[PDB]
Symmetry: C3
Subunit: 449 residues, 3 copies
C-alpha cells in the first residue's frame, strides 16, 4: 500500500497537478493486476448510477472516496469527473465492463445422422430350433424366426415342416451430419473491466472470490453462481443446436438415437425381418429396417442466439456473452478531491425489415440497421414479446438481428424501441412454412438377399 502514501494534496500548477495525479493513478493500477492496453475511443458512459461519497484520513493524508455499483454486463460504463476542491478540472476516468460471460468445455460423445443403408448377415437351418444365443458383431441387432422350413418353402433336400430356423444380424449405415458433445466442466465467469483516463487504458480480469484492491481504486465482483449451460449440445455445420438430444448410450426415440462413437455405430430397435420361399433353393431374407433412427427430429432443435462456439479438436467450449452476471462494486479513493459522475447522451439512427408468421414455430424475424456514434447498451422494448431483452450497439457493425413472438396480430408497422430511438419496422406476414419430415421412417432401405 505504498502508492497511496504519496500526497499530492497541493501543487501550485494545475497542469503539473493533473499530470501528477494521472501518473499516481497510472502506477497505482500498473503496479497491481491491471495491464496497459489500447484505448477504445468510442466507449462513453450512457447512464448514471447511485453513488456514496466520503472521506477517510490516514496519518497526515486525507483521501476522498466515491463508491458506486454497476450491473455486470458487457458494454456497460460509468463516468467520473475528479476535481480538486472546487477547482477544475483534474481528470476524467471512464469504467466500462469489456467482457461479461460464462463458459464450459464439452467432450465429444458421438456422431449421428440419417440411415443410408443396412449391412446384413444371415443364415438358415433346415432342422432344429433357432440358436439360443445368436452370434452377432458388437452393436448389431439379431433377428430370428422359428419353424421356417415348411412344405413348398424348403431348401434343397430339406423335408422337415414347422422346424428349422432363419436368423441374422443387421447394422445401419449412416452419413454423419452432426456431432453431439456433453458438458464436462462447471460454468466459469470471465469478467474484464477497464479504466480509461488521459488517453490511456488499463484492464483487468475480475474474480468472484478475490477483490482487486489497489491503493487508489478498488473493485469487487458480487454475484450468485447459478448458470444454465445446456448439458448436451449438438453441433451441425458450425452451428449450435439444443433440445432433447440423447446422452451417450441412450437410445430413446429422438435426435441421436443412432450413435457412432469411435469406430462402430450403435443403435437399438426391432428389425423388420421376413423371408421368401423357394421349393428347392435357399430362402430369401427381407430386411426393411434395422435400427430405429429418429434423426429427422434433429431438424426441430432450437438454435440459441445468445451462445457462441469455440471448436477445438474433440472438445467444444460454449460461451454466453450477452447476459447480466451480477454487480460490480467500485470505490475510487484518489486523494483529497471531489467527484462528480457523468454520462453522455446517445444518438442512434435505425431502420428495419421484419417478416414471419403467427402461431407458428418460426414466429417473426427482424433485420435492423443501427448506426450509433458511441457504444451503447440499449434495452429494447416492443408491443410483441422480443426474444432478447436488450441489444448492444457499436459504431463498427451496423447490422443487427432480433426475433419476436406476437401474441397479437401485427400489421405493416412494427414498433420497437432501442434506447430512446423509437423505430418503426416494416413487416410483411408470410404464411407459416409447411411442416416436412415430421413423421418417422418406417423403412430405412429395402434389402432382399
Amino acid at each position: 500500500g505504498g502508492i497511496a502514501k504519496i500526497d499530492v494534496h497541493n501543487i501550485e500548477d494545475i497542469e503539473q497537478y493533473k499530470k501528477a495525479i494521472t501518473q499516481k493513478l497510472q502506477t497505482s493500477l500498473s503496479l497491481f493486476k491491471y495491464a496497459k492496453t489500447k484505448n477504445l475511443p468510442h466507449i462513453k458512459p450512457i447512464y448514471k448510477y447511485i453513488t456514496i461519497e466520503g472521506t477517510e484520513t490516514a496519518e497526515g493524508i486525507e483521501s476522498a472516496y466515491i463508491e458506486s455499483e454497476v450491473p455486470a454486463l458487457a458494454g456497460t460504463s460509468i463516468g467520473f469527473k475528479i476535481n480538486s476542491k472546487e477547482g477544475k478540472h483534474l481528470l476524467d476516468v471512464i469504467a466500462y465492463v469489456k467482457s461479461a460471460s460464462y463458459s464450459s468445455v464439452y467432450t465429444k460423445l458421438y456422431s449421428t445422422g440419417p440411415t443410408s443403408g443396412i449391412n446384413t448377415k444371415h443364415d438358415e437351418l433346415c432342422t432344429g430350433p433357432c440358436p439360443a444365443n445368436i452370434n452377432h458383431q458388437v452393436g448389431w441387432l439379431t433377428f430370428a424366426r422359428e419353424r421356417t422350413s415348411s412344405h413348398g418353402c424348403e431348401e434343397f433336400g430339406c423335408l422337415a415342416v414347422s422346424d428349422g430356423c432363419v436368423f441374422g444380424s443387421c447394422q445401419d449405415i449412416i452419413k454423419e451430419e452432426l456431432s453431439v458433445y456433453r458438458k464436462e466442466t462447471e460454468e466459469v465467469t470471465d469478467v474484464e473491466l477497464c479504466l480509461t483516463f488521459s488517453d490511456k487504458t488499463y484492464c483487468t480480469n475480475l474474480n468472484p472470490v478475490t477483490p482487486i484492491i489497489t491503493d487508489l481504486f478498488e473493485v469487487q465482483f458480487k454475484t450468485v453462481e447459478t448458470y444454465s449451460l445446456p448439458r448436451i449440445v449438438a453441433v451441425q455445420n458450425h452451428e449450435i443446436k439444443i433440445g432433447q438430444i440423447n446422452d451417450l448410450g441412450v437410445y430413446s426415440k429422438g435426435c441421436g438415437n443412432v450413435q457412432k462413437v469411435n469406430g462402430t455405430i450403435y443403435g437399438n430397435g426391432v428389425p423388420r425381418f421376413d423371408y421368401l420361399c423357394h421349393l428347392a433353393s435357399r430362402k430369401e431374407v427381407i430386411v426393411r429396417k434395422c435400427f430405429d433412427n429418429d434423426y429427422q427430429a434433429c431438424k426441430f432443435l432450437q438454435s440459441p442466439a445468445s451462445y457462441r462456439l469455440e471448436e477445438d479438436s474433440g472438445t467444444v467450449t460454449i460461451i454466453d456473452y450477452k447476459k447480466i452476471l451480477g454487480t460490480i462494486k467500485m470505490k475510487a479513493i484518489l486523494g483529497d478531491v471531489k467527484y462528480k459522475t457523468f454520462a453522455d447522451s446517445v444518438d442512434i439512427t435505425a431502420e428495419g425489415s421484419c417478416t414471419g408468421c403467427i402461431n407458428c414455430f418460426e414466429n417473426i424475424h427482424c433485420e435492423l440497421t443501427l448506426h450509433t456514434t458511441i457504444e451503447a447498451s440499449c434495452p429494447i422494448k416492443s408491443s410483441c414479446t422480443v426474444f432478447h431483452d436488450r441489444i448492444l450497439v457499436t459504431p463498427n457493425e451496423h447490422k443487427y438481428a432480433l426475433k419476436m413472438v406476437c401474441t397479437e396480430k401485427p400489421g405493416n408497422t412494427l414498433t420497437i424501441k432501442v434506447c430512446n430511438t423509437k423505430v418503426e419496422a416494416s413487416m410483411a406476414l408470410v404464411d407459416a412454412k409447411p411442416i416436412i419430415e415430421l413423421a418417422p421412417v418406417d423403412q430405412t432401405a429395402y434389402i432382399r438377399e
Copy 2:
C-alpha cells in the same frame, strides 16, 4: 411544519411525477414489518446541502420498508413507505402439438394372391406400414387363389385420439418485471424497474441489482387450464412417455411397431387384426408435476408463463431530499392462525395443510417447520384468510405438526391417511381391437 411538510410532499410528488411514475391510490394496509441496514450521509451541491439515506431491499413481492423524514432536531415531518409491488419473470411459448389417449385406429389394407410384398408400401402422411409375406397357404386363400407360402398382406394404420392436453415450447428468453411504489401523505406513485438503467430523480434514486438466470421450463404441458411440467416430448420426438403421439396442424403423428396379424378364410379375403398402431404413453402424462409457483396467460397458440413468488435481486435506494434527518421504521406484525394437515409418508402426494391466517397488515412471512415445507415462505394479506401449503415429513408425525408463520407459532392438526393407490402406471399393450 405544515407549510414545509406540504412543500416536501408536493416537491417530491412532482419530482417523481416528472419521471415515469404513475399515481395510484394508497393502500393503508401495506406497512413495513422489518428494518434493514442503512448508510446515511450528506452531499453538498453548490450552496444547498442535502442529506441522503441509502438502503437495500430484497426484490420480492410483499416486501416493504419504512422511512421517517424529520427536520434537524425535530420530529416528525413525514412517513414514506417503499413497497415492492411486482417481482416476477415470464416467457411466452409456442404451441407444438395436442396429445391424448388413443380412442381408435384407422387402417387400410390390401392383399395379394401372388408375389412378394411391395418393396415400398404406399402410405398416407404420418401413418405406419405393416406387411407379412407368404400369406396365401392351404386353407388360407381368397377365391381363385391356389398358391402356397406366397402372396402378401400389407397395410397402413394411424391412431385416432381425443385431444385432452396441449404442449408448448419456450420461445423467448426469460424477462423480469419488477414494480415498486412510494406512499406519502396518502398518495402513491409506482414504476417498473430495469436491470440496465437506474431510475434517478433529483430527490429519489432506485437501482435494481440481479443476475440474469431463471428457471423457466423449456417445454410445458397445459391440461384443463392448469400448467403441468415433467418429461414431455418436444416436437417430433417420439420417445416413450408423455406426448409420444403428437397431433400437429391437421394430422396425428406417432411411432412404434404396429401389432398386426391376420385371420384365414377359405374362399374370402383375409381379415386383418390390429391391436396397436402408435406407441401411446399418454397415461404417463398423469404423473407430471404441477408447480405452484407459476401462473398462466393463455393466448391462442401461445402461452405466457409467469413466476411471481421468488427473490429476483436487490432494490437499492438513495433518498436525497434536503436538510432533514432520517429514521427508519417498521411496525410489528400480528397474525393469528390455525392449521389442518393430512397426508402420508414416503409417498408421491406427501402432506397437504390448510392454514387459517388472519393478519392486520400485508406481510412477507418466512415459514418454518420441523418437516420440510415445499415453499420456504408465504405472503399473508388482510384479504384472504385461508392459505394452503404442502410438506414432506421424512419420519412419522403425530397429532401435532408444528408450523411457524412469521413470529406466530402454530400447532397444526395432523392425521395420517394411507397413500393413494397407484393406478394406470403400466403401459397399454393394446390401444384397440381392430378386426375387418
Copy 3:
C-alpha cells in the same frame, strides 16, 4: 485503562449477540481472513451518543471470512473480530419413485387354443406384457386332439425379473438456502443462520443476506451405493429407452416393449414357447450417467435430501457499529505447500484426474488457475484434510509438468497420459434371457 475497556466492549458485543439469535460455539483457531474487501465507514448519531460504523460486503461462500481490528481513537488496539461464513448451501428433499437394475430373468404365462382366433382382450397381470400369434395350428404343428389348419391361437403374458441395483428419486420441495455466519473475538465464537427475507439487526452489529432465488437442483436423481448420479433418468411411468425404463414401484415391476416371442412345434407334445426378451431394459446406460462432485446426500427411509455446498449464493452485507472506535480491516497471507499427480487422456470421456496434497495453516477458499480447463473454478483447503481432487479437460497434449495454482502457491503436477479406457457395454441387450417352456 485499555484492559477494562476492551473487556467492557467484548462483553457489550457479547451480550448484544447473546441478546439476539446468535449461539455460542467452540472458537476455531484456523479461521483467519485471506482477502481484504471494500469498506465504507461513517458515523451515526443516536440522541446524545455518537457511534462509528464500518460497512463491508462479502460473497456468501463457505469458508469466506473478513477481518476487523478495533482501535481506540489515537490508540491501539482493543479487539479483533473475524466474520466467518461457515455454511453456504442450498438443498431439496426428494421422494422415491422406483428401483431399477438389469434383467435377471423373465416370468411367462401362456395358453393355447386349437380353434378360433386369438382373444380380443388377452388376460394379463398388472404390469405384464401380452403376446399373441394367430394361425398356430398348422400342418405338422399340433397338440393332441387338434383337428384344424391355419387356425387357433397362442397367447401369453410376461414380466422381467430384475435385481435392484439402483434407486431413482424425484425432487418434491423447492430449493431452500442455508447460510450460517459466525463471529470470533476474545476466543469466543457466535454463529447464526441467515434469511434472505429478514435482516439480523443487533445493537452493535447488523447483517443482511442478498441473493437471487434460482438454483439448479436436478429434478430426477439416481442413487447407487450411497452415491448420487445424474443424467437422463426416466420419471415415474416414463418408459423411454434409457436409464430407468424398467421401474419397480411398490410391489410390482412395470416396463414396456415388444416381447420377442415365438414357439416350437412338437408332434407328440404341447408347443414350447421361446421368449428372448420381455421388457426393454436399458439399465446399461445408467453406467454412463455423470456423478456430480458438488453435491452430498442425506438418506432417510424412502426420501433423499440433496445439498449443494460449494457455490456462491449471494452477498453478505455487514454493518459493525461498536461505538466510538476506529476500524481497520485485516487479512493475513496464505502459506500453502503442495504436490500433485495427474493422469488421464485427451479427446476422451474421462479426461484428466489430479490428486493434490495441499497443506495449509489456515482455512482458505482458493481460486485455482491452470493452463487447461479445470472442472471446478476453485478449491477450499482446510488444515484437517490434506488430499484434494480436481479434474481437467486439456484441449492440447500435456507434457510431464502440468502447472496448477492454488491461491498463490504454484504447483508442479506430475502428468502421465494414459490411453482412453476401452468402451464396454455401450450396445443394448437384444436378449435378456432364453426362456423355453
